[PDB]
Design a binder for this molecule. Structure first.
Ligand code: MG
Ligand code: MG
Ligand code: MG
Length: 66
RNA sequence: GGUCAAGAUAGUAAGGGUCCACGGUGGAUGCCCUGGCGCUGGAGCCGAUGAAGGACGCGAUUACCUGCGAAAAGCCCCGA
């Protein structure tokens, strides 16, 4: 999900979570410019997930520092 | 009526002229507003927490614009 699946997980996972999200994003690219990339959405969605992840580790790391 | 004689005037337009009909060119005029212009009133500073203003980037296809900043036409929270 968007709220309930990120803040339950710890950041040492986030680093390599980011990492794998990237990796798939990259292979996706290679596909795209190789053709055909029949599911363009998946790209932007992975973007969305990434932005989520970082927003999360950020707000969190700074709210645990209270 | 044919010949000859004397004398007179017609029509053709290569082209042009005036008018008429019919288009072409051009974009005046009328209408319209998606843009202005002034007056009244309101509001009036930004920035070392990086300003105004940019450069390069972010798109399934992206040259211009717009939005954005490698979390990149967007990301989290609340409210309509
Ligand atoms: Mg002639
Ligand atoms: Mg631009
Ligand atoms: Mg909302």
């Amino acid at each position: 999900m968007k709220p309930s699946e990120m803040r339950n997980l710890q950041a040492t996972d986030f680093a390599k979570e980011i990492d794998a999200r990237k990796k798939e994003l990259m292979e996706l690219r290679f596909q795209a410019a190789a053709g055909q990339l029949a599911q363009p959405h998946r790209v932007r969605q992975l973007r969305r997930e990434v932005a989520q992840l970082n927003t999360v580790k950020a707000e969190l790391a700074r709210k645990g520092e209270q």
